[PDB]
Design a protein around this ligand. Structure first.
Ligand SMILES: N[C@@H](CO)C(=O)NS(=O)(=O)OC[C@H]1O[C@@H](n2ccc(=O)[nH]c2=O)[C@H](O)[C@@H]1O
Ligand SMILES: N[C@@H](CO)C(=O)NS(=O)(=O)OC[C@H]1O[C@@H](n2ccc(=O)[nH]c2=O)[C@H](O)[C@@H]1O
Ligand code: NA
Ligand code: NA
Lengths: 421, 377
């Protein structure tokens, strides 16, 4: 949600900034709803003044021995219309609230203005993509050799976009997630959390997936119970820890990390790049609004540190205005080198949401200067999507015989295995 | 599913064995559908109806299973360890965990409603340490091959292990428009056992031993309103075996020993119960439950269920192996056991390891996973 006062008073300036994202704010409907509210409000003030005067005139008419029936009838009608004016004002505000829940976040002024992914800029890259002495195999070919990466059995169980891992490939995937959580908790100041993987609709509205992106979620319909949704990311469960709260400024920043499965039914056919279920180690920050853009740089560096320690070549992209997620003011995407594709592929998105999610969940902090509750800023970033990191490890660490060399940092988690297959 | 030949040649003995479970075999409806189809063929709708009945029949209990009507007829076969005598008033896991916000039911209820939990900091780390310890133990010492599986399955996998068609109400279903519906797994038994469905294994591939650490999702109305003992979501480290039928009862003893070893290493006193005929799960021929000591309850509470399913799930899945003696593809036997339910192990750890001041001693085997933490709070 954007500042409702800003949307109502400056629709044209808000529309100009949203236009950089290719989003067309319905200024005509906002102005028409505002004109309707003003018209009804002026009528209710005129009515309130009229009714109060007629009610007091009854007392005076009684003192004169006069007929109070014309005054009682005016009071009754005026009161009835005032009740309608209230239902009208609530229905107008209700329509405006529903509209304001469908508006994307305002991009920060430091975001390059662009209409598509071609206006995204490379910020930096680290590491050199290996030049192999043989014909590179993709993760599917590498993993299928001994049945340790199995899409056929997964399809037998669950249909398309699922995977089964076994033996050393299952162990490597677990080693990756453990490595990620251990790193963020030990060196990056994150507090570990285990969360529910099923949430009700208010949590999803809090982070922005609802009301607009319901179709991308798996929903569990329940008889005379609130519906449950499978989390698309731990961002939903973690960010909502602080919903409806007034935090002490001394508690900021609140830094959370969770390793969870992530479920998406969103409308890369071969492999585990795009899945209905995938593990992701998620980093979430609840911060002082004054520090959030600096916090984003640190968040992006925490995700980068995983790729650097795994010696995986990667690139950092600054997303342009036309290529950002709904709730983001600024995003950095990390893309890892994928030998079989001869290109970098997305492995993380690190975003500053500003006060947009905090407004939807009423996540506040008490400002030390004013002593008043103010909205916190929120940030989230993948550190990292675990299945995609597995794809990157298998392909970058492949040897001539189809075996996989175990990354140095993963050897303590691999029970003596240094070479897979 | 039961051997259809047995249901045909011995209906009275099969009905008498099922009666010990409190199940009444509709011998008349089977005898009628057999006499009708024999007349209909002599002169496919009757088959579809018999199949539905056949799929609603629970497994035959093994002869060694104690006969009893309910949980009060369960037999304690052995125990391990001495439940600790505390020199102060014992607190439950809820009071222990809530102290610093590290176990939070309130934030979890705000997110998802009742029967969910949020863990943070050292309690979240302790839960993760428990699941890592369990999967590391079974893979290094007990011969299990690790597996990562889907947590969403379609209806055939659940029918393969027995949750479908009879127990649909206990599952969370994701209704999908113009696609087959998905169900959240109630246990990794579902995904793991179905690995071998519709296959003919080589006898040399046996025993196939799988271990997975997965969340488990259940919506059961039949069954602990306070705490994380009963949850709509809980982690569990599942052990599954696909075996040669001649070895399955010996395999059950080894599987139960694998679950017990987790409790022994964590120094958690427990007891082993042989479930009676009337307290057995639908797909089991024989079950041992492990019940861990819970100091605030002054009793042992279920933490694991280890079962031999015989050829029941193998029949539903058409999971076979080529018998080396006959050359014929024969049904395998399947087994499954919790090694262990992670949330309930965390409950057992917080309560058994609690100190007078409300702090929690870290079990010895978990100290390598706790990043220097030896005392929680
Ligand atoms: N909470 C934020 C930051 O993690 C978020 O979820 N953003 S994201 O870009 O939608 O998702 C975060 C990351 O998840 C991975 N991913 C996505 C879809 C899929 O099928 N498989 C994947 O591995 C992508 O690499 C992506 O950068
Ligand atoms: N696949 C087999 C063997 O694990 C199986 O699922 N059996 S079981 O008994 O249904 O479930 C296995 C175990 O899961 C635990 N449990 C159960 C319900 C709940 O809400 N929370 C729990 O922690 C119980 O300790 C139980 O013994
Ligand atoms: Na993205
Ligand atoms: Na049980």
């Amino acid at each position: 949600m954007l500042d409702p006062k800003l949307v109502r008073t400056q629709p044209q300036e808000v529309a100009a900034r949203l236009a950089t994202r290719g989003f067309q704010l319905d200024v005509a409907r906002i102005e028409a709803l505002e004109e309707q509210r003003k018209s009804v409000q002026t009528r209710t003030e005129q009515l309130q003044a009229e009714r109060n005067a007629r009610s007091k005139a009854i007392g005076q008419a009684k003192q004169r021995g006069e007929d109070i029936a014309p005054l009682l009838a005016d009071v009754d009608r005026m009161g009835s219309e005032l009740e309608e004016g209230k239902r009208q004002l609530d229905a107008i505000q209700g329509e405006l609230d529903a509209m304001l829940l469908g508006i994307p976040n305002l991009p920060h002024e430091s975001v390059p203005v662009g209409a598509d992914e071609d206006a995204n800029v490379e910020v930096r890259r680290w590491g050199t993509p290996k030049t192999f002495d043989f014909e590179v195999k993709d993760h599917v070919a590498l993993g299928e050799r001994h049945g340790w990466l199995d899409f056929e059995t997964a399809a037998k169980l669950s249909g398309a976009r699922f995977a089964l891992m076994r033996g050393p490939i299952a162990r490597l995937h677990r080693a990756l997630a453990q490595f990620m959580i251990n790193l963020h908790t030990a060196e990056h100041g994150y507090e570990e959390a285990y969360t529910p993987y099923l949430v009700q609709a208010p949590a999803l509205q809090g982070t922005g997936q609802l009301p607009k992106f319901e179709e991308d979620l798996f929903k569990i319909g329940r008889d005379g119970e609130a519906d449950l949704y499978l989390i698309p990311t731990a961002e939903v469960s973690l960010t909502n820890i602080v919903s409806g709260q007034i935090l002490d400024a001394k508690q900021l920043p609140l830094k959370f990390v969770a390793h969870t499965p992530c479920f998406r039914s969103e409308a890369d056919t071969r492999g585990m790049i795009r899945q209905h279920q995938f593990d992701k180690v998620e980093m979430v920050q609840i911060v002082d609004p004054a520090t959030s853009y600096e916090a984003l740089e640190g968040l992006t560096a925490n995700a980068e540190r995983v790729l650097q320690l795994l010696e995986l070549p990667y690139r950092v992209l600054a997303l342009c205005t036309g290529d950002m997620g709904f709730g983001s003011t600024k995003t950095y995407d990390l893309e890892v080198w994928v030998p079989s594709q001869d290109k970098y592929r997305e492995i993380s998105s690190c975003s500053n949401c500003g006060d947009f999610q905090a407004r939807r969940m009423q996540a506040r902090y008490r400002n030390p200067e004013t002593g008043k509750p103010e909205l916190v800023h929120t940030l989230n970033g993948s550190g990292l999507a675990v299945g995609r990191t597995l794809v990157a490890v298998l392909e970058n660490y492949q040897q001539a015989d189809g075996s996989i060399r175990v990354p140095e940092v993963l050897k303590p988690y691999m029970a003596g295995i240094e070479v897979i297959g």
